[PDB]
Amino acid sequence: KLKDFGKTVPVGIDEENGMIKVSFMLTQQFYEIKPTKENEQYIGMLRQAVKNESPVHIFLKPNSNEIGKVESASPEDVRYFKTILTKEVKGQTNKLASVIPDVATLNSLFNQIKNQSCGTSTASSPCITFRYPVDGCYARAHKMRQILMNNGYDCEKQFVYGNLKASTGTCCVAWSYHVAILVSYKNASGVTEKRIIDPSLFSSGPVTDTAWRNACVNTSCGSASVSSYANTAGNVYYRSPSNSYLYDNNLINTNCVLTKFSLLSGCSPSPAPDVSSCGF
């Protein structure tokens, strides 16, 4: 009767209103488990796995974000997850420009990125699923970076973590983390500044990282707060709270996730459809 969610690494466990909120690598979604006697071992398994950044096998109650069962990972699972969620740091091959020359160019890049939004006639496949903020921030950010790279630039990622909530203006989503591209550019006087580009939250243009993180703690949606943020090299697809990195060097996962979410919009479905079939 339970839905097989597959293997994953839990990265956070946080008590709220008599329920345990669990976060997992890569996905922005929170899962929940009730602190009942019958769940006490599943909860311990999750706590230890969070502590040690180790994988578990998750089963969900159907049509929900509620965990119904947790099973241990095999030695093979442990070995595999160590290979993909890694402390090994690998940089880009070619040397693109890390600093955009002026605001006009920054703005051009913004427009190119927004022109790739799903739901706009200018976009090519796979389009960037900005209109679907439920999940997939990681894929949207990696695709934004690819656009910069197509123009000869690289950038950073900024990952923000916490009890996050954001509004589209019509509905709210809850996230354990969010990511967008953090672009360096020279201002009018030649001094380097940084801005976030994230059309899923700011449709008008680049914004400060302070403003961007503030949009991730929108208290009109409910309780919200930031616990941490970290800037990384652009090539990092996902960064865990333990500072491990996951990569998607050829955008195999990115394009697969964007394709899966292409027709989705708004704050539903939630949780998002399964993207486990997407590999690297």
- Shortest CA distance to 182 belongs to which of 75, 106, 269, 82? 106
* Phi then psi dihedrals of residue 196, to 5 deg: -80, 140
- Shortest CA distance to 22 belongs to which of 3, 53, 43, 52? 43
By the 8 A CB rule, do 209 and 194 touch? yes
d(CA 33, CA 60): 10
Please state whether beta strands 3-8 and 56-60 pair in parallel, antiparallel, or not at all (unpaired). antiparallel
Q: Domains in the chain: how many in total?
A: 2
d(CA 236, CA 90): 9
Q: Is residue 267 part of a domain?
A: no
- Shortest CA distance to 2 belongs to which of 51, 61, 48? 61
Residues forming a β-bridge with 7: 57
d(CA 180, CA 206): 11
Same domain as 221, residue 125: yes
* Phi then psi dihedrals of residue 106, to 5 deg: -55, -45
Residue with structure tokens 């697969």? 256
DSSP class of 115: T
Three-state secondary-structure class, residue 259: helix
Q: For the chain, what is the largest distance between any 2 Cα atoms, rounded to a whole number of angstroms? A: 63
Same domain as 86, residue 104: no
Let me know the angle formed at the C-alpha of 191 by 186 and 197, rounded to the nearest 5 degrees.
Answer: 45
Cis peptide before 273 (omega within 30 of 0): no
Same domain as 238, residue 105: yes
- Residue 66: give the domain boundaries: 1-90
d(CA 134, CA 72): 28
Same domain as 96, residue 83: no
CA atoms within 13 A on the CB side of 79: 3
Tell me the three-class secondary structure of 34-77, residue by residue: CCCHHHHHHHHHHHHHHHHCCCEEEEECCCCCEEEEEEECCHHH
Helix or strand (DSSP H, E) at 150: helix 137-150
**Which residues fall within 8 angstroms of residue 87, CB to CB, at 6 or more apart?**
243, 244, 245
* Phi then psi dihedrals of residue 48, to 5 deg: -65, -40
d(CA 262, CA 11): 27
Say how many C-beta atoms besides its own lie within 10 A of residue 203's C-beta: 11
Say how many C-beta atoms besides its own lie within 10 A of residue 143's C-beta: 23
Helix or strand (DSSP H, E) at 11: strand 10-16
Q: Where in 138-244 does DSSP place strands (E)?
A: 156-167, 172-186, 192-197, 225-233, 236-239
Q: Is residue 199 part of a domain?
A: yes
**Which residues fall within 8 angstroms of residue 256, CB to CB, at 6 or more apart?**
275, 277, 278, 279
Token pair of 149, please? 């790279």
Same domain as 239, residue 120: yes
Q: What is the dihedral sign for C-alpha 5, 135, 262, 141?
A: negative
Query: Domain of 207: which CATH number?
Result: 3.10.620.30
Let me know the angle formed at the C-alpha of 172 by 171 and 176, rounded to the nearest 5 degrees.
Answer: 155
CA distances from 219 to 47, 80, 131, 222, 226 (A): 28, 39, 21, 5, 12
Residues forming a β-bridge with 14: 21
DSSP class of 255: H
d(CA 209, CA 159): 10
Same domain as 162, residue 51: no
Q: Is residue 65 part of a domain?
A: yes
Q: What is the dihedral sign for C-alpha 16, 17, 20, 24?
A: negative
Same domain as 118, residue 254: yes
Query: Domain of 28: which CATH number?
Result: 2.40.50.340
Q: 149 exposed, middle or buried (CB, 10 Å; 0-12, 13-18, 19+)?
A: middle
The whole-angstrom distance between residue 50's C-alpha and the CA centroid of its chain comes to 18
* Phi then psi dihedrals of residue 183, to 5 deg: -100, 130
Same domain as 107, residue 54: no
Three-state secondary-structure class, residue 30: strand
Three-state secondary-structure class, residue 267: coil
Same domain as 156, residue 244: yes
Token pair of 126, please? 């796979």
d(CA 186, CA 14): 40
How many Å is the Cα radius of gyration of the chain?
19
Token pair of 11, please? 């990265």
